[PDB]
Amino acid sequence: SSLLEKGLDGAKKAVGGLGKLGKDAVEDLESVGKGAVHDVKDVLDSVL
């Protein structure tokens, strides 16, 4: 369910990097349910 800009889940991660020190919490537990395998796997592939 993504209706608007704030309907995206990565919105709490990508566009708020400088503020992403404490707000990161839902991301942690939702990443597991959404397949934590893909999260770590994709980061190890798409390295910044």
What is the domain partition of the chain in residue ranges? 5-46
Is 45 labeled as ligand-binding? Answer: no
Residue 9, classified by CB atoms within 10 Å of its CB into exposed (0-12), middle (13-18) or buried (19+), is middle
Residue 7, classified by CB atoms within 10 Å of its CB into exposed (0-12), middle (13-18) or buried (19+), is exposed
| Fold entry, domain 5-46 | Helix Hairpins (6.10.140)
Is 42 labeled as ligand-binding? Answer: yes
Is 30 labeled as ligand-binding? Answer: no
Q: Which amino acid is at 36?
A: A
What kind of experiment solved this structure?
NMR
CA distance linking residue 21 with residue 44, whole number of Å: 21
Instruction: For residue 46, report the phi and psi dihedrals to the nearest 5 degrees.
Output: -90, 80
Angle of helix 36-45 versus helix 26-33 axis, rounded to 10? 100
CA distance linking residue 42 with residue 3, whole number of Å: 25
Secondary structure of residue 4 in the 3-state scheme: coil
Contacts 24+ apart (CB under 8 A), 6-13: 9/34
